[PDB]
Short mmCIF file of C-alpha atoms and ligand atoms in Angstrom, two decimals:
data_model
loop_
_atom_site.label_atom_id
_atom_site.label_comp_id
_atom_site.label_asym_id
_atom_site.label_seq_id
_atom_site.Cartn_x
_atom_site.Cartn_y
_atom_site.Cartn_z
CA UNK A 1 0.19 -0.15 -0.33
CA UNK A 2 3.56 2.63 -0.52
CA UNK A 3 2.44 5.99 -1.84
CA UNK A 4 4.33 5.17 -5.17
CA UNK A 5 6.13 7.69 -7.55
CA UNK A 6 3.69 8.06 -10.77
CA UNK A 7 4.37 9.50 -14.37
CA UNK A 8 2.40 9.41 -18.08
CA UNK A 9 1.58 5.81 -19.30
CA UNK A 10 2.03 7.65 -22.61
CA UNK A 11 3.04 10.58 -24.20
CA UNK A 12 0.77 13.62 -25.11
CA UNK A 13 1.02 16.60 -27.69
CA UNK A 14 -0.70 19.49 -27.59
CA UNK A 15 -0.54 23.39 -29.81
CA UNK A 16 -0.81 26.33 -27.95
CA UNK A 17 0.37 30.18 -28.10
CA UNK A 18 2.72 32.10 -24.81
CA UNK A 19 0.40 34.49 -23.79
CA UNK A 20 3.82 36.51 -23.52
CA UNK A 21 5.94 35.99 -27.09
CA UNK A 22 2.49 35.62 -28.78
CA UNK A 23 4.93 32.43 -31.10
CA UNK A 24 2.97 29.42 -31.45
CA UNK A 25 4.69 26.06 -29.89
CA UNK A 26 4.07 22.79 -29.65
CA UNK A 27 4.07 20.88 -26.53
CA UNK A 28 5.04 17.09 -25.28
CA UNK A 29 4.71 15.75 -22.64
CA UNK A 30 6.56 12.27 -21.94
CA UNK A 31 6.63 9.53 -19.19
CA UNK A 32 10.15 9.25 -17.19
CA UNK A 33 12.29 7.80 -14.88
CA UNK A 34 11.98 7.17 -11.20
CA UNK A 35 13.75 10.28 -9.15
CA UNK A 36 13.18 12.97 -12.97
CA UNK A 37 11.01 15.69 -11.24
CA UNK A 38 9.16 17.80 -13.77
CA UNK A 39 12.27 18.35 -17.07
CA UNK A 40 11.26 21.10 -19.53
CA UNK A 41 13.36 20.61 -22.78
CA UNK A 42 13.66 23.31 -25.19
CA UNK A 43 14.27 20.77 -28.48
CA UNK A 44 13.71 23.11 -31.03
CA UNK A 45 17.94 23.78 -29.95
CA UNK A 46 20.43 23.00 -30.75
CA UNK A 47 22.03 20.92 -28.46
CA UNK A 48 19.10 20.60 -26.74
CA UNK A 49 18.88 22.71 -23.02
CA UNK A 50 16.70 20.77 -20.11
CA UNK A 51 15.77 23.03 -17.31
CA UNK A 52 14.70 20.90 -14.07
CA UNK A 53 11.92 23.13 -12.57
CA UNK A 54 13.28 23.56 -9.75
CA UNK A 55 13.02 26.41 -7.22
CA UNK A 56 17.68 27.12 -8.01
CA UNK A 57 16.38 27.52 -12.11
CA UNK A 58 14.08 30.30 -11.71
CA UNK A 59 15.10 33.61 -13.13
CA UNK A 60 12.67 37.43 -13.06
CA UNK A 61 8.98 36.56 -11.74
CA UNK A 62 7.46 39.81 -13.26
CA UNK A 63 4.67 38.65 -15.26
CA UNK A 64 5.20 34.56 -15.33
CA UNK A 65 7.32 31.85 -13.15
CA UNK A 66 10.78 31.23 -15.56
CA UNK A 67 13.32 29.25 -15.64
CA UNK A 68 16.67 29.71 -16.44
CA UNK A 69 19.78 28.05 -17.82
CA UNK A 70 22.11 30.42 -19.07
CA UNK A 71 20.94 33.12 -21.52
CA UNK A 72 17.26 29.67 -22.08
CA UNK A 73 14.56 30.88 -20.50
CA UNK A 74 11.05 28.09 -20.27
CA UNK A 75 8.21 30.94 -19.77
CA UNK A 76 4.91 31.01 -17.68
CA UNK A 77 5.51 26.79 -16.33
CA UNK A 78 2.68 27.72 -14.00
CA UNK A 79 0.04 26.60 -15.05
CA UNK A 80 1.37 23.31 -16.62
CA UNK A 81 3.14 22.52 -13.04
CA UNK A 82 -0.14 22.96 -11.24
CA UNK A 83 -2.44 20.81 -13.61
CA UNK A 84 1.30 18.47 -12.75
CA UNK A 85 0.74 18.71 -8.81
CA UNK A 86 -3.50 18.22 -8.90
CA UNK A 87 -2.62 14.65 -10.55
CA UNK A 88 -0.05 13.70 -8.65
CA UNK A 89 3.04 13.30 -11.33
CA UNK A 90 6.40 13.19 -10.05
CA UNK A 91 8.41 12.39 -12.56
CA UNK A 92 7.43 14.05 -16.71
CA UNK A 93 9.60 15.43 -19.72
CA UNK A 94 8.57 18.75 -20.85
CA UNK A 95 9.30 19.17 -24.71
CA UNK A 96 8.26 22.71 -26.05
CA UNK A 97 9.32 24.30 -29.50
CA UNK A 98 9.56 27.82 -28.42
CA UNK A 99 10.65 29.55 -24.85
CA UNK A 100 6.72 29.07 -23.65
CA UNK A 101 4.14 27.49 -22.47
CA UNK A 102 1.23 26.98 -24.10
CA UNK A 103 -1.55 29.62 -22.51
CA UNK A 104 -4.00 27.32 -24.08
CA UNK A 105 -6.79 28.60 -22.45
CA UNK A 106 -5.66 30.56 -20.07
CA UNK A 107 -5.95 27.89 -17.25
CA UNK A 108 -5.00 23.83 -16.07
CA UNK A 109 -7.82 22.53 -17.91
CA UNK A 110 -6.71 21.41 -20.90
CA UNK A 111 -4.04 20.13 -19.07
CA UNK A 112 -5.20 18.51 -16.46
CA UNK A 113 -7.13 16.60 -19.37
CA UNK A 114 -3.99 15.90 -21.56
CA UNK A 115 -2.42 13.71 -18.74
CA UNK A 116 -5.58 12.41 -17.81
CA UNK A 117 -6.07 11.40 -21.47
CA UNK A 118 -2.15 9.93 -21.18
CA UNK A 119 -2.81 7.82 -18.09
CA UNK A 120 -1.03 7.56 -15.04
CA UNK A 121 1.84 4.52 -14.25
CA UNK A 122 3.09 3.87 -10.66
CA UNK A 123 5.92 3.61 -10.56
CA UNK A 124 8.92 1.39 -7.84
CA UNK A 125 10.20 3.89 -5.44
CA UNK A 126 8.08 6.03 -2.58
CA UNK A 127 7.45 8.75 -3.29
CA UNK A 128 9.49 12.43 -1.08
CA UNK A 129 7.36 14.23 0.11
CA UNK A 130 8.11 17.86 2.42
CA UNK A 131 5.87 17.92 5.06
CA UNK A 132 5.91 21.32 7.30
CA UNK A 133 7.85 21.38 10.80
CA UNK A 134 7.46 24.92 11.45
CA UNK A 135 4.97 28.48 9.84
CA UNK A 136 7.74 29.90 7.33
CA UNK A 137 6.22 33.17 6.56
CA UNK A 138 7.88 35.98 4.22
CA UNK A 139 6.42 39.44 3.69
CA UNK A 140 7.24 42.55 2.08
CA UNK A 141 5.29 45.34 1.71
CA UNK A 142 1.44 44.81 2.55
CA UNK A 143 1.76 41.03 0.39
CA UNK A 144 2.24 38.03 2.59
CA UNK A 145 2.85 34.35 2.19
CA UNK A 146 3.08 31.80 4.44
CA UNK A 147 3.79 27.80 5.49
CA UNK A 148 2.05 26.52 7.97
CA UNK A 149 2.03 22.59 9.73
CA UNK A 150 -1.24 20.99 8.67
CA UNK A 151 -1.91 16.80 8.01
CA UNK A 152 -2.64 17.04 4.28
CA UNK A 153 -2.67 20.05 1.88
CA UNK A 154 -4.51 22.91 1.50
CA UNK A 155 -4.00 26.75 0.00
CA UNK A 156 -5.67 29.62 1.33
CA UNK A 157 -5.33 32.92 -0.08
CA UNK A 158 -6.94 36.82 -0.71
CA UNK A 159 -6.60 39.07 -2.36
CA UNK A 160 -8.16 43.44 -2.59
CA UNK A 161 -8.13 44.99 -5.91
CA UNK A 162 -10.69 47.95 -5.25
CA UNK A 163 -12.21 47.33 -8.80
CA UNK A 164 -16.27 47.18 -9.01
CA UNK A 165 -15.69 43.77 -10.32
CA UNK A 166 -15.17 42.11 -6.37
CA UNK A 167 -15.09 37.11 -3.03
CA UNK A 168 -11.35 37.83 -3.05
CA UNK A 169 -10.70 35.55 -0.48
CA UNK A 170 -11.01 30.92 -0.95
CA UNK A 171 -9.29 27.95 1.07
CA UNK A 172 -10.02 24.81 -0.91
CA UNK A 173 -9.26 20.90 1.43
CA UNK A 174 -7.42 18.90 -1.55
CA UNK A 175 -8.03 15.74 0.49
CA UNK A 176 -12.11 16.99 0.87
CA UNK A 177 -12.06 19.35 -2.33
CA UNK A 178 -10.71 17.86 -6.18
CA UNK A 179 -8.64 20.34 -7.96
CA UNK A 180 -10.14 19.71 -11.05
CA UNK A 181 -13.47 20.04 -10.47
CA UNK A 182 -12.79 23.47 -7.71
CA UNK A 183 -9.40 25.02 -8.81
CA UNK A 184 -7.95 23.84 -12.66
CA UNK A 185 -10.39 25.41 -14.40
CA UNK A 186 -9.84 28.89 -13.46
CA UNK A 187 -8.45 31.17 -16.13
CA UNK A 188 -5.75 33.97 -15.87
CA UNK A 189 -6.94 38.01 -15.83
CA UNK A 190 -5.98 40.78 -16.60
CA UNK A 191 -6.74 44.65 -16.52
CA UNK A 192 -7.58 47.17 -19.69
CA UNK A 193 -4.94 49.70 -18.32
CA UNK A 194 -2.57 46.86 -17.29
CA UNK A 195 -2.51 45.14 -21.14
CA UNK A 196 -2.52 48.18 -22.45
CA UNK A 197 0.98 49.05 -20.72
CA UNK A 198 2.68 44.76 -21.58
CA UNK A 199 1.80 45.82 -25.62
CA UNK A 200 3.23 48.15 -26.13
CA UNK A 201 6.60 46.16 -23.30
CA UNK A 202 5.94 43.15 -26.11
CA UNK A 203 4.51 41.33 -22.97
CA UNK A 204 0.71 39.67 -23.82
CA UNK A 205 1.13 39.23 -27.63
CA UNK A 206 -0.41 36.00 -26.63
CA UNK A 207 -3.42 37.47 -24.47
CA UNK A 208 -7.21 36.89 -25.61
CA UNK A 209 -10.73 37.23 -24.46
CA UNK A 210 -9.86 32.98 -25.68
CA UNK A 211 -7.16 32.55 -22.78
CA UNK A 212 -8.13 35.24 -20.16
CA UNK A 213 -10.81 36.91 -18.34
CA UNK A 214 -10.43 39.98 -19.63
CA UNK A 215 -10.88 43.57 -17.09
CA UNK A 216 -12.38 46.57 -18.36
CA UNK A 217 -13.24 49.10 -15.12
CA UNK A 218 -16.72 48.24 -14.45
CA UNK A 219 -17.12 44.86 -15.46
CA UNK A 220 -15.87 41.03 -17.56
CA UNK A 221 -15.56 41.71 -21.46
CA UNK A 222 -15.98 37.53 -21.83
CA UNK A 223 -19.33 37.31 -23.11
CA UNK A 224 -19.64 33.82 -21.31
CA UNK A 225 -18.23 35.77 -17.72
CA UNK A 226 -17.07 34.29 -15.64
CA UNK A 227 -16.74 30.28 -14.48
CA UNK A 228 -16.51 30.32 -11.00
CA UNK A 229 -18.28 33.39 -8.45
CA UNK A 230 -14.31 33.79 -7.14
CA UNK A 231 -12.26 32.46 -10.63
CA UNK A 232 -9.50 35.48 -9.59
CA UNK A 233 -8.69 33.83 -6.29
CA UNK A 234 -9.04 30.97 -7.04
CA UNK A 235 -6.35 31.37 -10.57
CA UNK A 236 -4.13 32.73 -8.00
CA UNK A 237 -4.96 29.19 -5.96
CA UNK A 238 -3.81 27.47 -9.16
CA UNK A 239 -0.53 29.85 -9.55
CA UNK A 240 0.73 28.90 -5.79
CA UNK A 241 0.02 25.33 -6.08
CA UNK A 242 2.24 25.74 -9.56
CA UNK A 243 5.36 27.78 -8.21
CA UNK A 244 4.08 25.06 -4.86
CA UNK A 245 5.78 22.79 -7.66
CA UNK A 246 9.14 23.92 -7.73
CA UNK A 247 10.05 22.48 -4.73
CA UNK A 248 10.78 19.38 -6.27
CA UNK A 249 8.55 17.40 -3.52
CA UNK A 250 4.66 17.29 -3.00
CA UNK A 251 3.80 19.57 0.42
CA UNK A 252 2.53 18.30 3.91
CA UNK A 253 1.24 21.26 5.26
CA UNK A 254 -0.71 24.87 4.80
CA UNK A 255 -0.18 27.99 2.56
CA UNK A 256 -1.51 30.40 2.96
CA UNK A 257 -1.66 33.56 0.33
CA UNK A 258 -2.16 37.13 0.98
CA UNK A 259 -1.57 39.71 -2.61
CA UNK A 260 0.74 36.90 -2.70
CA UNK A 261 1.89 36.13 -6.59
CA UNK A 262 5.35 34.24 -8.28
CA UNK A 263 7.65 36.68 -6.83
CA UNK A 264 7.03 36.53 -2.87
CA UNK A 265 6.43 33.07 -3.00
CA UNK A 266 9.71 32.19 -4.46
CA UNK A 267 11.06 33.95 -1.38
CA UNK A 268 9.13 31.49 0.36
CA UNK A 269 9.93 28.62 -1.40
CA UNK A 270 13.55 30.34 -0.61
CA UNK A 271 13.27 30.70 2.51
CA UNK A 272 11.95 27.16 3.34
CA UNK A 273 13.93 25.26 1.62
CA UNK A 274 17.34 27.34 3.77
CA UNK A 275 15.72 26.57 6.93
CA UNK A 276 16.01 23.46 7.10
CA UNK A 277 15.37 22.96 10.75
CA UNK A 278 11.19 23.95 9.72
CA UNK A 279 10.86 21.21 6.76
CA UNK A 280 11.49 17.21 6.68
CA UNK A 281 11.52 14.26 4.24
CA UNK A 282 9.37 11.80 4.24
CA UNK A 283 8.23 8.57 2.40
CA UNK A 284 4.22 6.80 3.77
CA UNK A 285 4.45 3.31 3.59
CA UNK A 286 0.36 2.99 4.12
CA UNK A 287 -1.89 5.31 1.49
CA UNK A 288 -4.46 4.37 3.91
CA UNK A 289 -3.07 5.98 7.23
CA UNK A 290 -0.95 8.84 5.44
CA UNK A 291 -2.39 12.93 5.72
CA UNK A 292 -3.88 12.98 2.24
O1 LIG B 301 -1.72 40.76 -16.18
C1 LIG B 301 -2.07 39.75 -16.55
N1 LIG B 301 -2.09 39.42 -15.60
C2 LIG B 301 -1.29 39.00 -14.44
C3 LIG B 301 -2.85 39.01 -13.61
C4 LIG B 301 -2.87 37.16 -13.77
C5 LIG B 301 -2.72 36.79 -12.42
N2 LIG B 301 -1.41 35.91 -11.93
C6 LIG B 301 -1.51 35.11 -13.20
O2 LIG B 301 -2.68 34.33 -13.94
C7 LIG B 301 0.12 33.86 -13.87
C8 LIG B 301 0.90 35.39 -14.78
C9 LIG B 301 0.38 34.95 -16.52
F1 LIG B 301 -0.78 35.48 -16.25
C10 LIG B 301 0.28 33.86 -15.38
N3 LIG B 301 0.21 33.24 -14.50
C11 LIG B 301 -2.72 37.72 -11.38
N4 LIG B 301 -2.40 39.05 -11.31
C12 LIG B 301 -2.39 39.90 -11.59
O3 LIG B 301 -2.11 40.48 -10.51
C13 LIG B 301 -2.34 41.56 -11.88
C14 LIG B 301 -2.95 42.49 -11.55
C15 LIG B 301 -1.26 43.18 -11.82
C16 LIG B 301 -2.11 39.49 -17.91
C17 LIG B 301 -2.97 37.63 -18.66
C18 LIG B 301 -3.07 38.13 -19.88
C19 LIG B 301 -3.70 38.90 -20.24
C20 LIG B 301 -4.17 39.55 -21.96
C21 LIG B 301 -4.03 39.97 -22.52
C22 LIG B 301 -4.65 40.27 -23.81
C23 LIG B 301 -6.19 39.77 -23.44
C24 LIG B 301 -7.30 40.53 -24.92
C25 LIG B 301 -6.32 41.07 -26.18
C26 LIG B 301 -4.88 41.48 -25.67
C27 LIG B 301 -4.12 41.13 -24.89
S1 LIG B 301 -2.84 40.82 -19.13
ZN1 LIG B 302 -1.88 32.53 -13.54
#
């Protein structure tokens, strides 16, 4: 009854556009061996450049989570890493034909469908977990991000936009609530005045109502509206779960964020890793007694 590492049963292919680059990209997800982790692979380059999805490999953290190795980058990993986390995938190669993961519909839903379509393969090695033993918190200005010990996995998040479209708080316990049903479909979002400024700096080149909630001063411009009453904060949870997967093992504990984002989330990851008294690596001989 040991909790085992998981990979894909089959290879998966998909096509899309990078949210920032607007470049067409071909994505392939491939099974990987035990103790590989998630590894991104720029197959458009010669020689091929591979970047393990790990906190040490994170570059700038402005408008997405970016992996960097020399002057090669992989942009906007957070939603695909979220999907991997949501289905418990430990080992996979992610092949990209360009610098950015495709945005798809703005959510992790297409990725969770692609992975489940491929099927999961249990491997003959114990899954390793990071268990939080001490509260670890980082703050900067009005923003805060925390890990608290918790016998399971759960994410709480609160946002605070002074905007007519604004609930700005949600908490999900992933042992009793489905990531697939409650979080995976939550789409990225953009305010018209940010979008106007990002374009002018050659960012959000791939953005559209097909892949993002577009908000003007008053309302969602998307014809078919929101998927969740609380879609915005549910998307922040989705982002956080992706960033958390850069720890390189699944977490037993609780993440709380207040106005947090990639920059402060990464600060928290680095602070947790640095304080070895605050965590331990653990395995489970028996899924029937385990905290998740
Ligand atoms: O601004 C964006 N994202 C950042 C937002 C979404 C959230 N971040 C995330 O989802 C992270 C970071 C990437 F967006 C994915 N993962 C948190 N957050 C913010 O806090 C904004 C308010 C400062 C945009 C997303 C799509 C845009 C467009 C567009 C567009 C539409 C029509 C035509 C032309 C172009 S702009
Ligand atoms: Zn996002």
